[PDB]
Amino acid sequence: KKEQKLIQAQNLVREFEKTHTVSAHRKAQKAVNLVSFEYKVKKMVLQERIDNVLKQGLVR
Amino acid sequence: IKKEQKLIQAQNLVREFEKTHTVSAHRKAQKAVNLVSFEYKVKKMVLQERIDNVLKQGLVR
Helix, strand or coil, rough: CCHHHHHHHHHHHHHHHHHCEEEEEEEEEECCCCCCCCHHHHHHHHHHHHHHHHHHHECC | HHHHHHHHHHHHHHHHHHHCCCCHHHHHHHHHHHHHHHHHHHHHHHHHHHHHHHHHHCEEE
């Protein structure tokens, strides 16, 4: 399901915002990449959320 | 030797990461550091700290 992929991406982006880990970054970006391009705006916001955590700083 | 080349590569890549702060540079640097031999433990500790310090400042894509 395409909706399932979107939900997984939402959850993993949330986790990345909580922890800022390198591992969480990769899981979140992977999940976002796997969402269908048809969810244009939803994906853009998820991507921007990832980008914002990246610039805040990361930990291993 | 191979180990000596791996050390210099890690040093170069950490320096590049300090300059650019990119996700790509982070990965290249961390992989290279991980490949450094335990005989260079202190240099590895220093390189790892340098990576950690860039990471906490924030990265660009």
